[PDB]
Design a protein around this ligand. Structure first.
Ligand SMILES: CCCCCCCC/C=C\CCCCCCCC(=O)O[C@@H](COC(=O)CCCCCCCCCCCCCCC)COP(=O)([O-])OCC[N+](C)(C)C
Ligand SMILES: CCCCCCCC/C=C\CCCCCCCC(=O)O[C@@H](COC(=O)CCCCCCCCCCCCCCC)COP(=O)([O-])OCC[N+](C)(C)C
Ligand SMILES: CCCCCCCC/C=C\CCCCCCCC(=O)O[C@@H](COC(=O)CCCCCCCCCCCCCCC)COP(=O)([O-])OCC[N+](C)(C)C
Ligand SMILES: CCCCCCCC/C=C\CCCCCCCC(=O)O[C@@H](COC(=O)CCCCCCCCCCCCCCC)COP(=O)([O-])OCC[N+](C)(C)C
Ligand SMILES: CCCCCCCC/C=C\CCCCCCCC(=O)O[C@@H](COC(=O)CCCCCCCCCCCCCCC)COP(=O)([O-])OCC[N+](C)(C)C
Ligand SMILES: CCCCCCCC/C=C\CCCCCCCC(=O)O[C@@H](COC(=O)CCCCCCCCCCCCCCC)COP(=O)([O-])OCC[N+](C)(C)C
Ligand SMILES: CCCCCCCC/C=C\CCCCCCCC(=O)O[C@@H](COC(=O)CCCCCCCCCCCCCCC)COP(=O)([O-])OCC[N+](C)(C)C
Ligand SMILES: CCCCCCCC/C=C\CCCCCCCC(=O)O[C@@H](COC(=O)CCCCCCCCCCCCCCC)COP(=O)([O-])OCC[N+](C)(C)C
Ligand SMILES: CCCCCCCC/C=C\CCCCCCCC(=O)O[C@@H](COC(=O)CCCCCCCCCCCCCCC)COP(=O)([O-])OCC[N+](C)(C)C
Ligand SMILES: CCCCCCCC/C=C\CCCCCCCC(=O)O[C@@H](COC(=O)CCCCCCCCCCCCCCC)COP(=O)([O-])OCC[N+](C)(C)C
Ligand SMILES: CCCCCCCC/C=C\CCCCCCCC(=O)O[C@@H](COC(=O)CCCCCCCCCCCCCCC)COP(=O)([O-])OCC[N+](C)(C)C
Ligand SMILES: CCCCCCCC/C=C\CCCCCCCC(=O)O[C@@H](COC(=O)CCCCCCCCCCCCCCC)COP(=O)([O-])OCC[N+](C)(C)C
Ligand code: NA
Lengths: 515, 113, 113
């Protein structure tokens, strides 16, 4: 009721009232509706621009007011904002209107009780639509331009260069958008959020500077770690010059164990999906590393089980090589395809197969007569373990099919064998190929983004390993975006678009040539 | 094969399949083939003085050959090898089958489609 | 600025000036924009048919002028031209308009460096 609300404000209504009730701050999303508990935010979150304009023009309205959560007007819009299919981008338009009316960075830099800015809150809650607007934000009108996050320093025809603000989006700060959008576990759209203009280019620029060399260096150390471990285990007794290699495996295993011990500790994995999507290689590397340590511990004692742990380290160590498939788009997209295939199809297929494998294993071994005193190997299906082994070899096409077993019901025994073949060789084995093709089609259209999401996690981890010094590989230095002593670290992106053909009157430098 | 539309389009299909899928599949398979080859041959005891052919996984070359025949479904699967940890030895064999026969071999068909 | 450019030509502006600067002839596609270094080609490559018509009608305009690369107006359009998803086929329409105005095969048969 815009007309009714208009006269209430003139009558002396409190435009700064806070609705701190339980309904306005629900614990869940079904028993209440959170909008900022303020009349200014209520109209903003309900797509009522006319009331918002009336409220902002009022002299007694506190735009920078904070609610119980510490959220300002901008924070409430971020939480309220949803996908384009749900909301008609009214929050993004409302976010621009309110920010321009204030005309200051105080509202944008305000932190709630969780210490998160509205820019940081978008990454925390996974609001790609709001994050895209804020990260790439141009204010064409004059008298207020420092509020922009995207600046075009020069433009000549279709070729133009854009500068993206990185004051709060970089690894320099303690908590930033880039760090949140990669290590987040409460959202499932990180790969879509990494495709933004500043975020995608920032990861690429730092990848080719230090991350590429460190990733190759890490592979070489790990490749030599497994090569040396394999040689000493394979060529084991059943010296004084090769002792350095043996000590390398023990020392490097400790380095992996310590690094993976703290990496999992600080990651705080809670959900099962987070284990397989963010920490699967943090465990298998840790498991492989501690197996070598365990083998050394058992080696010096009288236990002979050290060899068993040593072999497991070899098999797992070479299996861990598939982590380094990332960095390459072809191999990286192949690796992420394996993970989806294993979880969606392989694990599902194995569960049913084992039931048929064990179900027919007991049945086939049941109708087997005892071998005569003359021949003690009358039937290959002597016991349950033997029956499963024969069926397992039958599935993989190994050995010979001898139906002349010592079965009291040979017709019944053969009937179950043929049924097992139809269920497994014809039905289960063949359907697995068809089912994966459905998953391959669904993943191939998004596996490229997933690989970059997995790779981006490696970039941040490598950057944290860097010491306090050596951080000279940052982006372009301070640029005079605004003459009022406004210098920001910006990333230069050049784009060509033969679409609009506008007149460039909102540039920073008249000369188009880079200098 | 070119000159004929049916055979020519078939030939160009092979080139894309080889580069996009076959070469990518072979690289991962060799890592699993060689990775399990050293592991399986590691826990193999020396054959007794009586029988010199106690285990078919005598060396690294023998271990890879047996696994290669296992992948292509040739020969017989004899798990009664001269392994000091038969349960561990069989555990790696089944893991290799799942990774190669069930996972790698089957996914290649889906990826090429 | 078609209106501003119109009075400049009448004032005595050089319609055959060559912008031989480094920016106008970049080594790559990110630090500069190549269009033919001439005002006639600049309007042609920027989808400005009105300025192109005004420039062509001028008696002092050299349609067959060659830049440092030896490219004529038609060569510059070919280099500037992109796919339909990127450019709204304005180069193809501009190519026809300029060629018909000249009405000769000298422009089409010219070879660059
Ligand atoms: C090879 C036999 C393996 C045997 C073991 C089995 C292992 C099997 C598992 C996986 C396969 C193994 C994959 C390799 C992993 C490490 C390499 C890597 O990804 O880093 C990079 C290092 O690229 C360079 O070499 C460039 C310079 C780095 C060297 C200098 C180091 C510091 C001095 C290569 O990546 P890229 O994509 O070429 O980077 C180019 C940049 N681009 C993406 C923008 C184009
Ligand atoms: C122009 C380029 C300049 C480059 C300058 C470089 C300066 C370097 C100087 C100092 C930094 C030292 C950091 C600790 C290194 C030891 C830790 C370790 O085990 O290595 C780690 C990496 O580290 C490497 O092997 C790469 C070198 C670092 C282990 O490798 P990873 O791949 O992390 O382990 C598996 C991945 N996982 C976590 C998913 C399981
Ligand atoms: C053979 C290498 C030929 C040269 C590279 C061929 C190739 O496409 O490799 C691919 C991987 O592939 C590898 O680099 C892994 C295989 C090489 C190691 C084994 C060599 C034989 C022993 C390179 O993948 P890409 O997609 O070019 O990686 C760049 C990523 N980008 C395109 C997003 C920037
Ligand atoms: C079972 C469920 C597995 C789910 C994870 C699959 C997976 O990551 O697949 C990967 C393929 O590479 C592999 O890891 C697949 C091969 C695994 C073989 C296991 C080792 C056997 C060796 C003996 C074992 C002895 C054990 C002794 C104890 C996919 O690679 P990715 O997509 O790059 O990585 C995904 C994970 N991340 C997103 C967190 C980085
Ligand atoms: C012989 C030993 C063989 C190897 C065993 C290795 C250890 C295995 C044990 C545990 C590892 C973790 C398993 C679960 C992983 C996370 C969930 C997941 O991906 O589920 C998948 C299904 O998965 C199933 O339906 C699982 C069926 C049983 C799995 C075990 C098979 C072997 C049993 C002996 C998801 O499938 P989806 O189509 O994406 O479903 C949509 C998601 N939704 C379900 C949330 C709606
Ligand atoms: C995924 C895996 C997870 C879990 C599954 C692990 C298998 C479960 C049973 C363990 C095996 C077992 O008890 O075997 C017994 C039979 O016992 C049976 O006959 C087993 C009946 C249960 C399985 C029936 C089908 C279930 C589907 C004994 O087997 P046997 O071959 O007679 O033993 C040799 C003789 N010996 C006893 C002298 C040593
Ligand atoms: C609910 C009711 C349903 C079924 C219950 C039947 C119980 C019968 C019990 C005694 C018979 C038995 O099991 O043995 C028989 C096999 O038996 C079969 O072949 C079983 C078939 C089961 C159902 C098949 C449905 C599909 C038909 C598919 C048709 C496939 C071809 C069927 C060709 C006939 C034959 O026995 P034998 O081995 O000759 O015995 C010799 C030893 N003795 C002389 C010491 C006894
Ligand atoms: C079939 C082989 C069996 C043995 C295989 C052994 C293993 C080797 C296997 C290899 C795989 C590829 C097999 C096929 C390639 C051989 C055929 C060939 O070159 O085709 C040619 C046949 O052209 C003629 O027949 C032209 C007419 C006669 C030519 C006379 C030459 C001059 C004579 C003296 C003066 C090309 O013609 P086309 O492709 O028919 O043209 C189709 C296009 N069209 C329909 C529009 C016209
Ligand atoms: C390995 C990577 C191969 C990449 C090329 C694949 C290819 O051309 O496929 C072709 C399939 O026809 C073949 O060439 C099939 C055989 C491929 C492997 C060679 C086996 C040689 C056997 C003996 C080994 C002896 C070893 C002796 C010592 C070395 C397709 O060819 P196309 O459709 O004509 O297109 C490609 C050709 N082009 C350049 C015209 C575009
Ligand atoms: C020793 C021999 C290899 C000699 C031929 C190398 C051919 C490389 C080029 C190629 O098509 O590789 C392919 C994979 O390729 C890989 O990533 C695997 C490379 C081989 C690894 C070793 C296998 C044994 C390229 O992968 P893709 O998914 O086709 O990449 C998209 C194509 N694009 C890069 C043009 C956008
Ligand atoms: C394709 C190109 C790749 C080719 C690579 C092929 C393998 C490389 C080694 C050659 C074989 C060798 O030397 O075997 C030796 C074993 O001793 C070893 O060398 C043990 C194996 C070392 C690590 C390899 C396994 C993991 C590879 C990870 C996979 C990633 C790398 C591949 C993908 C890029 C020979 O010893 P033997 O077998 O006992 O010999 C019997 C006779 N004699 C005892 C009298 C001497
Ligand atoms: C890691 C946990 C096991 C570490 C090794 C210590 C246990 C051990 O002795 O080896 C285990 C390997 O291991 C298995 O049989 C289980 C498979 C390991 C990975 C499971 C996932 C048990 O092996 P085993 O063959 O029972 O060892 C006794 C040998 N015997 C059967 C001749 C008496
Ligand atoms: Na077979």
């Amino acid at each position: 009721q815009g007309d009714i609300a208009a006269l209430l404000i003139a009558a002396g209504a409190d435009v700064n009232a806070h609705a701190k009730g339980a309904f306005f701050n629900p614990k869940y999303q079904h028993e209440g509706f959170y909008f900022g508990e303020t009349p200014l935010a209520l109209a903003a979150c309900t797509n009522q621009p006319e009331i918002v304009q009336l409220l902002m023009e009022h002299e007694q309205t506190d735009i920078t007011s904070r609610d119980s959560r510490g959220n300002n007007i901008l924070h409430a819009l971020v939480t309220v904002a949803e996908d384009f299919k749900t909301q008609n981008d009214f929050v993004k338009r409302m976010y621009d209107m309110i920010l321009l009316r204030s005309g200051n960075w105080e509202l944008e830099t305000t932190r709630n009780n969780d210490g998160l800015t509205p820019l940081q809150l978008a990454a925390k809650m996974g609001k790609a639509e709001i994050l895209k607007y804020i990260l790439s934000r141009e204010i064409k009108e004059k008298r207020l331009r420092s509020l922009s996050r995207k600046f075009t320093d020069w433009a000549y025809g279709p070729v133009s260069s854009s500068l993206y603000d990185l004051t709060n989006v970089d690894t320099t700060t303690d908590n930033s958008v880039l760090e949140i959008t990669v290590y987040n576990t409460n959202i499932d759209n990180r790969h879509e959020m990494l495709t933004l203009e500043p975020l995608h280019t920032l990861l690429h620029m730092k990848w080719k500077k230090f991350a590429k060399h460190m990733f190759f260096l890490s592979f070489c150390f790990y490749f030599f770690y497994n090569i040396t471990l394999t040689l000493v285990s394979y060529y084991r007794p059943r010296g004084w010059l090769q002792l350095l290699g043996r000590m390398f495996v023990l020392i490097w295993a400790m380095c992996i164990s310590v690094k993976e011990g703290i990496a999992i500790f600080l990651l705080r994995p809670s959900d099962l999906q987070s284990i397989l999507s963010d920490a699967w290689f943090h465990f298998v590397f840790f498991i492989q590393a501690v197996l070598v340590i365990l083998s050394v511990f058992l080696y010096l004692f009288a236990y002979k089980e050290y060899l068993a742990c040593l072999v497991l380290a070899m098999a797992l160590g070479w299996a861990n090589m598939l982590y380094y498939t990332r960095g390459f788009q072809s191999m990286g997209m192949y690796s992420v395809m394996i993970q989806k295939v294993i979880l969606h199809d392989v694990l599902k297929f194995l569960f049913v197969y084992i039931v048929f494998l064990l179900g027919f294993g007991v049945a086939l071994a049941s109708l087997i007569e005892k071998c005569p005193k003359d021949n003690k190997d009358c039937s290959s299906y002597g016991s349950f373990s033997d029956a499963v082994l024969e069926l397992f070899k039958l599935t993989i096409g190994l050995g010979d099919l001898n139906i002349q077993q010592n079965s009291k019901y040979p017709i019944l025994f053969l009937f179950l064998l043929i049924t097992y073949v139809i269920l497994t060789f014809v039905l289960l084995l063949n359907m697995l190929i068809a089912l994966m093709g459905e998953t391959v089609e669904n993943v191939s259209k998004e596996s490229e983004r997933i690989w970059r999401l997995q790779r981006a996690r490696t970039i941040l981890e490598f950057e944290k390993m860097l010491p306090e010094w050596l951080r000279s590989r940052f982006r372009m230095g301070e640029l005079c975006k605004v003459a009022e002593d406004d210098f920001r670290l910006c990333l230069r992106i050049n784009e060509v678009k033969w679409t609009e053909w506008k007149t460039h009157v909102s540039f920073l430098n008249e000369d188009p040539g880079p200098v």
